[PDB]
Design an enzyme around this catalytic site. Structure first.
Site, PDB file in Angstrom:
ATOM      1  N   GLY A   1      -0.492  -1.976  -3.037  1.00  0.00           N
ATOM      2  CA  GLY A   1       1.181  -2.593  -3.219  1.00  0.00           C
ATOM      3  C   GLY A   1       2.373  -2.613  -3.984  1.00  0.00           C
ATOM      4  O   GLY A   1       2.188  -1.550  -4.503  1.00  0.00           O
TER       5      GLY A   1
ATOM      6  N   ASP B   1       9.667  -6.017   3.767  1.00  0.00           N
ATOM      7  CA  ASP B   1       8.209  -5.443   2.691  1.00  0.00           C
ATOM      8  C   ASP B   1       7.932  -5.119   4.649  1.00  0.00           C
ATOM      9  O   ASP B   1       6.179  -4.375   4.274  1.00  0.00           O
ATOM     10  CB  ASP B   1       8.160  -4.844   2.095  1.00  0.00           C
ATOM     11  CG  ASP B   1       7.416  -3.880   1.314  1.00  0.00           C
ATOM     12  OD1 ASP B   1       8.621  -2.430   2.352  1.00  0.00           O
ATOM     13  OD2 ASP B   1       6.540  -3.453   1.257  1.00  0.00           O
TER      14      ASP B   1
HETATM   15  O1  LIG Z   1      -0.001  -6.183  -3.287  1.00  0.00           O
HETATM   16  C1  LIG Z   1      -0.352  -7.093  -1.876  1.00  0.00           C
HETATM   17  O2  LIG Z   1       0.726  -8.026  -2.203  1.00  0.00           O
HETATM   18  C2  LIG Z   1      -1.287  -7.600  -0.870  1.00  0.00           C
HETATM   19  C3  LIG Z   1      -2.261  -8.531  -0.977  1.00  0.00           C
HETATM   20  C4  LIG Z   1      -3.302  -8.750  -1.186  1.00  0.00           C
HETATM   21  C5  LIG Z   1      -3.852  -7.203  -0.252  1.00  0.00           C
HETATM   22  C6  LIG Z   1      -4.553  -7.963   0.957  1.00  0.00           C
HETATM   23  C7  LIG Z   1      -5.378  -9.395   0.935  1.00  0.00           C
HETATM   24  N1  LIG Z   1      -6.476  -8.873   2.284  1.00  0.00           N
HETATM   25  C8  LIG Z   1      -7.104  -7.588   2.477  1.00  0.00           C
HETATM   26  N2  LIG Z   1      -8.112  -6.787   3.107  1.00  0.00           N
HETATM   27  C9  LIG Z   1      -7.968  -6.023   2.924  1.00  0.00           C
HETATM   28  C10 LIG Z   1      -7.063  -4.978   2.391  1.00  0.00           C
HETATM   29  C11 LIG Z   1      -7.565  -3.131   2.136  1.00  0.00           C
HETATM   30  C12 LIG Z   1      -8.916  -2.809   2.887  1.00  0.00           C
HETATM   31  C13 LIG Z   1      -8.470  -1.243   2.526  1.00  0.00           C
HETATM   32  C14 LIG Z   1      -7.453  -0.584   2.043  1.00  0.00           C
HETATM   33  C15 LIG Z   1      -5.867  -0.946   1.752  1.00  0.00           C
HETATM   34  C16 LIG Z   1      -5.949  -2.684   1.878  1.00  0.00           C
HETATM   35  C17 LIG Z   1      -5.955  -6.016   1.241  1.00  0.00           C
HETATM   36  C18 LIG Z   1      -6.370  -7.068   1.380  1.00  0.00           C
HETATM   37  C19 LIG Z   1      -2.626  -6.404   0.553  1.00  0.00           C
HETATM   38  C20 LIG Z   1      -2.051  -6.425  -0.609  1.00  0.00           C
HETATM   39  C21 LIG Z   1      -1.400  -5.273  -0.791  1.00  0.00           C
HETATM   40  C22 LIG Z   1      -1.909  -3.411  -1.078  1.00  0.00           C
HETATM   41  C23 LIG Z   1      -2.368  -2.537   0.286  1.00  0.00           C
HETATM   42  C24 LIG Z   1      -2.299  -3.136   1.230  1.00  0.00           C
HETATM   43  C25 LIG Z   1      -1.023  -4.174   0.953  1.00  0.00           C
END
Ligand SMILES: O=C(O)c1ccc(-c2c[nH]c3ncc(-c4ccccc4)cc23)cc1C1CCCC1
Ligand SMILES: [Cl-]
EC number: 2.7.11.17
Length: 264
Positions: A13, A130
């Site tokens: 992220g 975002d």
């Molecule tokens: O960086 C952040 O603030 C952040 C925090 C939590 C998640 C998350 C919570 N459950 C999730 N299940 C699945 C996935 C996931 C699975 C496959 C591919 C990418 C992301 C991500 C998550 C995702 C993120 C970001 C990372 C990239 C997408 C947004």
């Protein structure tokens, strides 16, 4: 922490990285966001302070169209801070650009999800800052949940009064790119219009590799619907209202819910 085995990286992220995390005892996988405090310093709100602002937001979140924080492994001795969420194993709904966009009707169902989530966040006094396709995670139930609260802010009263820029350039509204301070809510609506546009076209409405040319296209050029794929006049009309360059006239969340493309 003791109960989790960290497996491969799944996404990245605004800050840190997300890793698939297995609870061996519970036979259950989670999404774990990993933040390195040494790495945070290099990237008046300081880092580490900014992390705990995020955590304070995350702990409030209880909606079907927003991700769920489970726990925070947070040992002051250790460098790493760990944020454990529920896994949505399919990941982001779309990454732009892509050759195969969604049908108009599948896009409508994903917009409803994003709007319902945004409404919740706005009701809770949070602006996301975002919103884009790659931060909308696809559930196994077919519904998307809003993720990544890295630049999100709490506010008081009707709206967040914001000075500086944050989030992704392509999804920043004209008023944010400076001088005067601007509506949080309105910046979220603009990003969701760009998101809706991506849902049906697979490419952003303003595209350029050089940021200065992107800024001018955002501030000046109109939205241009290509001839293919064909979408409906009702959708085009909602998109133009969401991508309205003046934040005063721009459609707010409560009227997006009453737009005939959304309801019928
Ligand atoms: O960086 C952040 O603030 C952040 C925090 C939590 C998640 C998350 C919570 N459950 C999730 N299940 C699945 C996935 C996931 C699975 C496959 C591919 C990418 C992301 C991500 C998550 C995702 C993120 C970001 C990372 C990239 C997408 C947004
Ligand atoms: Cl693009």
């Amino acid at each position: 922490l003791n109960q989790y085995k960290l497996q491969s990286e799944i996404g990245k992220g605004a800050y840190g990285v997300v890793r698939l995390a297995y609870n061996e005892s519970e036979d259950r996988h989670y999404a774990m966001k990993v933040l390195s405090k040494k790495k945070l310093l290099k990237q008046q709100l300081l880092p580490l302070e900014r992390v705990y602002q995020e955590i304070a937001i995350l702990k409030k979140l209880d909606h079907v169209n927003v991700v769920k924080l489970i726990e925070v492994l947070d040992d002051p001795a250790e460098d790493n801070l760990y944020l454990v969420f529920d896994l949505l194993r399919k990941g982001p709904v779309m990454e732009v650009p892509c050759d195969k966009p969604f049908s108009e009707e599948q896009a409508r169902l994903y917009l409803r999800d994003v709007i319902l989530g945004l409404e919740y966040l706005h009701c809770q006094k949070i602006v996301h800052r975002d919103i884009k396709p790659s931060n909308l995670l696809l559930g196994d139930d077919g519904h998307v949940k809003i993720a990544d609260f890295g630049v999100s802010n709490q506010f008081e009263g009707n709206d967040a009064q914001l000075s500086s820029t944050a989030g992704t350039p392509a999804f920043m509204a004209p008023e944010a790119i400076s001088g005067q301070s601007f509506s949080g809510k309105a910046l979220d609506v603009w990003a969701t219009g760009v998101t809706l546009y991506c849902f049906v076209y697979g490419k952003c409405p303003f595209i350029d590799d050089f940021i200065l040319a992107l800024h001018r296209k955002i501030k000046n050029e109109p939205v241009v619907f290509p001839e293919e794929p064909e979408i409906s006049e009702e959708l085009k009309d909602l998109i133009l209202k969401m991508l309205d360059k003046n934040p005063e006239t721009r459609i707010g969340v409560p009227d997006i819910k009453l737009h005939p493309w959304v309801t019928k």
